[PDB]
Amino acid sequence: TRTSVLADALNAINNAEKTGKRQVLIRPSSKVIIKFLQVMQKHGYIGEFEYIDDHRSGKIVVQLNGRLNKCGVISPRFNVKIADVEKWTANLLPARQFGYVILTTSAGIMDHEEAHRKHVSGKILGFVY
Amino acid sequence: MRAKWRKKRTRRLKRKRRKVRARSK
Amino acid sequence: MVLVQDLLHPTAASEARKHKLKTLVQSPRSHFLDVKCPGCLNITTVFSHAQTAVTCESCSTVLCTPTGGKAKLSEGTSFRRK
Amino acid sequence: GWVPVTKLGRLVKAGKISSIEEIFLHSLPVKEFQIIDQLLPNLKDEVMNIKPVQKQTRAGQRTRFKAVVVVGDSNGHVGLGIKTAKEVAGAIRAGIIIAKLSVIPIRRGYWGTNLGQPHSLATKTSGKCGSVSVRLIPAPRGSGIVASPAVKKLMQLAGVEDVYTSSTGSTRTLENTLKAAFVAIGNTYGFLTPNLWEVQALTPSPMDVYADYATAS
Amino acid sequence: SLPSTFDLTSEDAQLLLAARVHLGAKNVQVHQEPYVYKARPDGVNVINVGKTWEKIVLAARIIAAIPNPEDVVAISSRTYGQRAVLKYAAHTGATPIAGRFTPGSFTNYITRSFKEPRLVIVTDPRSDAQAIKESSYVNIPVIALTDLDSPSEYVDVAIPCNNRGKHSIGLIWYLLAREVLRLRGALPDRTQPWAIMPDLYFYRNP
Amino acid sequence: MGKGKPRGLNSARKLRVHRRNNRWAETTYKKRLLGTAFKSSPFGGSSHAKGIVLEKIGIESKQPNSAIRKCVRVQLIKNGKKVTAFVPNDGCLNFVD
Amino acid sequence: GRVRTKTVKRASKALIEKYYPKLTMDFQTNKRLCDEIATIQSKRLRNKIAGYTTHLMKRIQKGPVRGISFKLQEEERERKDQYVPDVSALDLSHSNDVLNVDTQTAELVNSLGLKLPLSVSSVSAVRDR
Amino acid sequence: MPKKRASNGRNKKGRGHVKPVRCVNCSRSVPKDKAIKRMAIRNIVEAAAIRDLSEASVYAEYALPKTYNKLHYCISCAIHARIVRVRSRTDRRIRAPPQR
Amino acid sequence: MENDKGQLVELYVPRKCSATNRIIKAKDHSSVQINIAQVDEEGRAIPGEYVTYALSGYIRARGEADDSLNRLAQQDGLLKNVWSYSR
RNA sequence: AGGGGAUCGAAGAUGAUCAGAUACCGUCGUAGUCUUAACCAUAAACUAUGCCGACUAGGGAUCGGGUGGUGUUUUUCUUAUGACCCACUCGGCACCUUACGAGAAAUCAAAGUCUUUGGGUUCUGGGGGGAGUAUGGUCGCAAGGCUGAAACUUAAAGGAAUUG
Ligand SMILES: [Mg+2]
Ligand SMILES: [Mg+2]
Ligand SMILES: [Mg+2]
Ligand SMILES: [Mg+2]
Ligand SMILES: [Mg+2]
Ligand SMILES: [Mg+2]
Ligand SMILES: [Mg+2]
Ligand SMILES: [Mg+2]
Ligand SMILES: [Mg+2]
Ligand SMILES: [Mg+2]
Ligand SMILES: [Zn+2]
Ligand SMILES: [Zn+2]
């Protein structure tokens, strides 16, 4: 089966961005996807993206910016206990300096810097660097 | 020696071993 | 199809070419052909892929032999589009 | 004893390329050797290992010597030459010469917070040569280079003050571990950041600008 | 941006169309590669002309952009272009290579025929290929006269063209030289068929 | 690829049972879990063993080198097992007696 | 087994390169011309050089040759490349009618151009290969 | 030992385990795929007749037929003489029918 | 990148490919600078003025350097009718 | 356990050869082979490539489905089927080039999207041997299978490629 759509989508992104396609298509297209992408937009790893409504399921067209390096997804959505964020981001992203860890939470879908300001953690989805 | 025969070798060795332990019920 | 395609607006050639499923929107490419039999002056809305030996409204004229894809319209018959 | 072939050779003799960045800026194919000595005076020049390496013959064998040479400074440029010549000295010579062609700069970063001059890597990089991954993996200040002796000496000549490594795979084959730690170094300017997001103008190269001064009459 | 002047003269189209530049490439058709305006039935592809000549100007614009002209190494191996390249050599003084390239001519700073281009021109990336694949080792563009069958690996500014050969090769070189001269040179006007001649290029009776 | 092993947020058991039952091919772990040290290994899983020199042997060594090694068959006290101990240094089985 | 050596063929190649003039077909002349210019130690070698030079001259009469195209041989094209036997007419004019163009080409001409000369062919696609 | 070939036995691809053919010379059972299936279209009469036969014969033009031995060879059997001919690593990629 | 208060550390601030935005490295022997001369009215190619376009080695070796340079030119006004939005 | 047994044909006889050779070859030729009713349950049962899932590159072909061509020919006048050509398409089976991607490499468009490490799942392996043995189950008419040890032993066993 097609399991984690988010992953299965971000995989296409990661393939697209690897070759230098200026865009990608993403079949299934969720809230999470869009709130994940929305996050990439707010930092700037991603251009426009255009959610098609198949009178049906979803479908997205992303515009890549040549800025994504990796559009990570961590797989069993591990629960994170606020301090353990530091151990995830340390182990996933290059450097204390720059990068983001896209985590769903009580607050919605933040990145790990926004989630530290708020003082609210939860599950992880993926990351970007 | 050739491994198929080294297999066949230890097949007889078992079938002799079966007669030995069967001689004491 | 390399690097930059602007994938929201394909050329209609591609849409017509690609699978009826494998486009931006799954739109079927079948129609409800309004067939007229030689007998009665009345028009049956024959779906082009019937799957059935399609009779008329009452008289047993037999309109369309259901083949695999589109049905072969039985004998010298006439039809409107959709 | 100079006399250059290659536009760029003549061009550096004229003194219109300053040193060195411009070469890298326009990825200029530095096939000649003299160039890098002229521009970079502080190239030292350290032989890692020298295996004997023998071809087998109708009778006996052919002992060549693959001398591995990390060339560098503490500025932020490093070289890696391997050369197999039958005489050993000549091999180190030709190794040093090759290492000064392959010479390559290193994005040196922080650690975390800028404060003082950078002397770790920016990011976690990796190399992969044969079956060695060198990963490294920027330190915090003063923690030291933490490395296989081979990787360390490469990272002394870089001027990376502090970095953790995860030299992984058969790191005992040194040619490869260096080639790995060379590529992981190469990767740096090559990995993007949000500090590059800001777009540049794309300058004209010295070749395009100083056309007349390059080439023969 | 543009002058809105160069829209291809009605005669020059007739010149291109005379050489069958757009009645070529055939069945075989690479997927890069949008220089088709329609395809004629059975063993034919029809090349979009406007796309060619905008690039023939673009190429020239780049060829002009190198200040030192004795530098743009044109190359040809496959015989039908050999003479045309040497004509392009004569008008715009830019050392080229007819026939055999010699590998290690852009690389390998010892060879007798060591060039060092700051632009390369090629007729058949099927054949001259080597020189193209070589040029990648030393950071040079590669203007090429690609048909819609040939590979454009390590190629920038691929002029669409018919490479059955014979006429179309020499014609398209001549239209380059033309627009390289018009873009900085003697000729100040797009008009006047002038002389020169297209037939100066072309393949000869051996 | 999924990479063999399970990845569920509720897998755990199919990890923790798998790693119990692969470990068993780790020869470090097997000796520790099965008490080869205690049940075998002449010394009782112990640094040392006092044992009475039953005889001074000369053991002709394996190949490349060639030397009779001057050893001692022992009888380990505690277990009553018999082993063969080497005697290091020039002669010194002379000192062993 | 008279195949002339490298030095023979190397010199004689470099001899005719620098001195196409001062080489009259016949041997004894070219022999004395060789001992003048190039500084041969031997007698036989010098005679053997002269022997190849001649064979190069005698080929030169029957057209040019590969590896032997220096200055005068370049010019002995070259005129012909410059002033070609062709062309009368243009050539590549609309000599017979006004171009037998195809339907697809006529349609292409109409899109880009406005009014050009045409002679619409039938476009017989044809059976078999 | 890695793969010499990608095909190996060749026809067999998408096809469990096909039937075999006894070879000609050795009578060595080989799959009808691994088989080296040469065609020997030989004349019924050898070239150095043929005149002699047609001289003594009744009729003109004649049947003069050709026997159609579709041979097979057990690769080994084939190598020992026949079309096989041990090619170079790079040359082994070529499927082109030889000569012609 | 920026130490203390600006003071831009780290030289070699790189050519980023015009097509991909991907970085062109110091040893991208494959990278390029296409320079294109500016046009003026009635002939004239304006000596010493270029619209520069770097290409990455990636797009160049694939073959996607062709159409990316078109689209690059097309957007930046050196062409018409060449690169299409849809295909 | 039945039926049949043509030829080959484990066993055997037997004719040569070689220092010898119950080994090829030679000649014959029960068991089988073939089949039917039971079992057995393993094979280089090998694509030595688990299954599903997505996405990355072109080339041309290749076939089983399906579209369009005032295309060509069939010719019984328009034909209409058929059969191609050409372009593109869902499904299948495999090649070419560069690899910028993988890979120890051979190679691989999957064995890619992996130290820039996380789509889902099942299984297997942890130096070589000892050993697929000992034992104990368990299954089998049995052969044997499945399951599966250590003590002891040893510095290599491999793999791929390079030159000889
Ligand atoms: Mg011995
Ligand atoms: Mg082997
Ligand atoms: Mg073998
Ligand atoms: Mg094996
Ligand atoms: Mg199948
Ligand atoms: Mg099978
Ligand atoms: Mg016998
Ligand atoms: Mg098995
Ligand atoms: Mg198996
Ligand atoms: Mg073991
Ligand atoms: Zn009715
Ligand atoms: Zn045989």
Author numbering:
A (entry chain W), G (entry chain R): 2 to 130
B (entry chain nn): 1 to 25
C (entry chain b): 1 to 82
D (entry chain C): 39 to 255
E (entry chain A): 2 to 207
F (entry chain X): 1 to 97
H (entry chain a): 1 to 100
I (entry chain V): 1 to 87
What does the paper say about this structure?
Type IV IRESs form a homogenous class of viral RNAs, which completely dispense with the requirement for any IFs and thus are able to directly recruit and assemble a translating 80S ribosome by themselves. The approximately 190 nucleotide sequence folds into a compact, well-defined three-dimensional structure making use of three internal pseudoknots (PKI-III). As a result, two stem loops (SL-IV and SL-V) are exposed and are responsible for the bulk of interactions with the small ribosomal subunit. PKI is an independent domain of the type IV IRESs that mimics a tRNA anticodon stem-loop interacting with a codon.
To gain insight into this process, we assembled a pre-translocation complex with CrPV-IRES and 80S, which was subsequently incubated with eEF2 complexed with the non-hydrolysable GTP analog 5'-guanylyl-methylene-bis-phosphonate (GDPCP). Several rounds of classification in Relion were needed to identify a class of particles consisting of the entire complex that produced a map with an overall resolution of 3.6 Å. Thus, the binding of eEF2 in the GTP form induces an extra rotation of the small subunit as in canonical tRNA translocation. However, the L1 stalk is 'pushed' in the opposite direction relative to canonical translocation, adopting a displaced position that is wider than the widest displacement seen in the rotated form of the CrPV-IRES/80S complex. The ASL-like element of PKI is pushed into a position in-between the A and P sites of the small subunit, reminiscent of an ap/P state. Additionally, a superposition of the CrPV-IRES in the ternary CrPV-IRES/eEF2-GDPCP/80S complex with the conformation adopted in the canonical, CrPV-IRES/80S binary complex (excluding PKI in the superposition) reveals a displacement of the ASL-like element of PKI of approximately 10 Å. Domains III and V of eEF2 solidly anchor the factor to the ribosome through interactions with ribosomal proteins uS12 and uL11 in the 40S and 60S subunits, respectively. These interactions help position eEF2 such that two loops at the tip of domain IV contact PKI. In our structure, H694 interacts with PKI while the diphthamide moiety (DPH) on H699 is closely packed against the sugar of nucleotide 6189 in the CrPV-IRES. The diphthamide appears to sterically prevent the rRNA decoding bases A1753 and A1754 from interacting with BP1 and BP2 of PKI, whose conformations were otherwise not altered upon binding of eEF2.
